Coordinates of C-alpha atoms in Angstrom, one line a residue:
Chain A
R838 CA 0.0 0.0 0.0
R839 CA 2.8 2.4 0.9
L840 CA 4.5 1.7 -2.4
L841 CA 1.3 2.3 -4.4
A842 CA 0.9 5.6 -2.6
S843 CA 4.5 6.3 -3.5
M844 CA 4.0 6.2 -7.2
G845 CA 0.5 7.6 -6.9
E846 CA 2.0 10.8 -5.5
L847 CA 4.8 10.6 -8.1
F848 CA 2.2 10.5 -10.9
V849 CA 0.0 13.3 -9.4
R850 CA 3.2 15.4 -9.2
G851 CA 3.0 15.3 -13.0
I852 CA 5.0 12.3 -14.2
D853 CA 3.6 9.5 -16.3
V854 CA 2.9 6.0 -14.8
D855 CA 1.6 2.9 -16.7
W856 CA -0.5 1.3 -14.1
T857 CA -1.4 -1.5 -16.5
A858 CA 2.0 -3.0 -15.6
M859 CA 0.7 -4.4 -12.3
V860 CA -3.1 -3.8 -12.6
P861 CA -4.4 -6.8 -14.6
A862 CA -7.0 -6.6 -17.4
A863 CA -10.5 -7.9 -16.3
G864 CA -14.1 -8.0 -17.5
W865 CA -16.1 -5.1 -18.7
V866 CA -17.5 -2.5 -16.3
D867 CA -19.8 0.4 -17.2
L868 CA -18.1 3.5 -15.7
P869 CA -19.9 6.8 -15.5
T870 CA -19.1 9.5 -18.0
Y871 CA -17.1 12.7 -17.6
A872 CA -18.5 15.4 -15.2
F873 CA -18.7 18.6 -17.1
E874 CA -18.9 22.2 -15.9
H875 CA -21.8 24.4 -17.0
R876 CA -22.5 28.1 -17.4
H877 CA -25.7 28.9 -19.2
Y878 CA -25.0 30.6 -22.5
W879 CA -27.8 32.1 -24.6
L880 CA -28.4 34.9 -27.1
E881 CA -31.8 36.4 -27.5
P882 CA -32.8 38.9 -30.2
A883 CA -35.0 42.0 -30.1
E884 CA -38.3 42.7 -31.8
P885 CA -39.6 45.7 -33.8
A886 CA -42.4 47.8 -32.3
Chain B
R838 CA -45.9 16.5 -97.4
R839 CA -49.7 17.0 -97.5
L840 CA -50.3 13.7 -95.6
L841 CA -47.6 14.7 -93.1
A842 CA -49.4 18.0 -92.5
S843 CA -52.6 16.0 -92.2
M844 CA -51.6 13.8 -89.3
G845 CA -49.7 16.7 -87.8
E846 CA -52.9 18.7 -87.6
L847 CA -54.6 15.6 -86.3
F848 CA -51.9 15.2 -83.6
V849 CA -52.1 18.9 -82.6
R850 CA -55.9 18.6 -82.4
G851 CA -55.3 16.6 -79.2
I852 CA -54.6 13.0 -80.2
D853 CA -51.2 11.2 -79.8
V854 CA -49.2 9.9 -82.7
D855 CA -46.0 7.7 -82.7
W856 CA -44.0 9.7 -85.1
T857 CA -41.2 7.1 -84.9
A858 CA -42.9 5.3 -87.9
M859 CA -41.7 7.7 -90.6
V860 CA -38.8 9.3 -88.7
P861 CA -36.1 6.8 -87.8
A862 CA -33.4 7.6 -85.2
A863 CA -30.0 9.0 -86.2
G864 CA -26.8 10.3 -84.6
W865 CA -26.9 12.4 -81.5
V866 CA -27.5 16.2 -81.8
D867 CA -27.4 18.7 -78.9
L868 CA -30.7 20.4 -78.8
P869 CA -31.7 23.6 -76.8
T870 CA -33.8 23.5 -73.6
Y871 CA -37.3 24.5 -72.6
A872 CA -38.0 28.2 -72.6
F873 CA -39.6 29.2 -69.3
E874 CA -41.8 32.2 -68.4
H875 CA -40.2 34.4 -65.8
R876 CA -41.6 36.7 -63.3
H877 CA -39.7 38.4 -60.5
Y878 CA -40.4 36.7 -57.1
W879 CA -38.6 38.0 -54.1
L880 CA -39.0 38.9 -50.4
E881 CA -37.6 42.2 -49.0
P882 CA -38.3 42.2 -45.2
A883 CA -37.9 45.1 -42.8
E884 CA -36.3 45.6 -39.4
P885 CA -36.4 48.2 -36.6
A886 CA -33.9 51.1 -36.2

């Protein structure tokens, strides 16, 4: 666990780690999608009198 | 010529004639196109100022 934390911190520092090396491939799992940010954007026109 | 004018008048009277009988096909010739009747059609909307 300590070693895993070690390269976890190393990766989060900004370095590249290939976790496929010790994490094995397994069956399919339906992961949730990306969580997007949202600011409402809209343009409305004007009308003649 | 007279007989040709005769069934030409008959055809223009409203009936249909298969003129392929006395007029066999020949080599290709580039013909003009249909002449349309043209009137100006357009929309010119307005807007506020």
